[PDB]
Design a protein around this nucleic acid. Structure first.
Ligand SMILES: [Zn+2]
Ligand SMILES: [Zn+2]
Ligand SMILES: [Zn+2]
Length: 86
DNA sequence: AGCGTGGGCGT
DNA sequence: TACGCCCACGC
């Protein structure tokens, strides 16, 4: 069930967890509490800040098992590994 | 390709 | 509640 409803008028979104509603509300408030120290851009989410920072540093923690090519994000690696199929 | 950013959730 | 994985949609 999703007992936690968004109280903003135009919005009919609901959530299973209260913290997910609190995160969602930032969309409506525009709150972007996490600032990149390098370029000063602000982000809604701390995890998205971390991956953004890799655009500046070149850090690529995730290597393809088949070919060893490195990526900044796990989902980016995932999208890549499939190219090695038939 | 590079990468923003919500969806759902384990801890 | 925060932190931060995965997952997913969308340029
Ligand atoms: Zn809402
Ligand atoms: Zn930055
Ligand atoms: Zn590969």
């Amino acid at each position: 069930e999703r007992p936690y409803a968004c109280p903003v008028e135009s919005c009919d979104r609901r959530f299973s967890r209260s913290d997910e509603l609190t995160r969602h509300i930032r969309i409506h408030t525009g709150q972007k509490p996490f600032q990149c120290r390098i370029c000063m851009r602000n982000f809604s989410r701390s995890d998205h800040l971390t991956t953004h920072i890799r655009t500046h540093t070149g850090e690529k923690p995730f290597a393809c098992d088949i070919c060893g090519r490195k990526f900044a994000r796990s989902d980016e690696r995932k999208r890549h590994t499939k190219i090695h199929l038939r």
